[PDB]
Design a protein around this ligand. Structure first.
Ligand SMILES: Cc1c([C@@H](C)NS(C)(=O)=O)cnn1C
Length: 185
């Protein structure tokens, strides 16, 4: 792809983080802690899952960023509406305001309803995310495999400002402690 020139500097919004997350000083990395991280509760925090939002809000234009997923067993990545539900149980779907892909149990899937199987020959260590607000497109690229396309959501109905979306996943297995990292431009 040739989307690299729309690169944006994403930082994580601490206030939105699940209370077990640990965000680095530079707000560019996030991992699952082994306990509650001693923060107060607020209406922004994702309560049921290890999720956090980017601080940036996008309502126009073309945006691109990259995320490192090295050695993780489970994660979700993409964008979501600023107005998504924070509390309780919900599924990742465009109807609920999410445009995402994930890794779970050795398979990659797009967060449609129902979910769509992805066809990835080279397991990615870094993912590129491209948003074209006006076109209604969210695309995912395999940076490990020369930028090959993973998935395109088209005909998106964003219906609001968009925020970068992250889920570091649970670590019930002891094999999913590694962080998500926003990669340098
Ligand atoms: C839902 C959950 C957590 C984190 C992600 N949520 S919480 C309770 O900190 O809001 C840890 N164990 N469980 C079962």
């Amino acid at each position: 792809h040739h989307h690299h020139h729309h690169m944006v500097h994403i930082t994580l919004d601490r206030n939105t983080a699940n209370s077990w997350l640990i965000i680095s000083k530079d707000r560019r990395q996030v991992r699952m802690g082994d306990t509650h991280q001693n923060v107060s509760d607020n209406k922004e925090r994702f309560s049921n899952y290890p999720m956090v939002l980017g601080a940036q809000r996008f309502s126009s234009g073309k945006m691109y960023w990259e995320v490192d997923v090295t050695q993780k067993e489970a994660w979700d990545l993409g964008v979501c509406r600023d107005s998504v539900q924070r509390k309780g149980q919900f599924s990742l779907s465009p109807e609920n305001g999410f445009w995402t892909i994930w890794l779970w149990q050795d398979s990659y899937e797009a967060g449609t309803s129902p979910q769509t199987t992805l066809h990835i020959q080279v397991p990615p260590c870094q993912i590129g995310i491209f948003v074209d607000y006006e076109a209604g497109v969210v695309s995912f690229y395999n940076i490990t495999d020369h930028g090959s396309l993973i998935y395109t959501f088209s005909e998106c109905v964003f219906a609001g400002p968009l925020r970068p979306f992250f889920n570091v996943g649970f670590n019930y297995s002891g094999g999913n402690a590694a962080p998500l990292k926003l990669c340098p431009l």
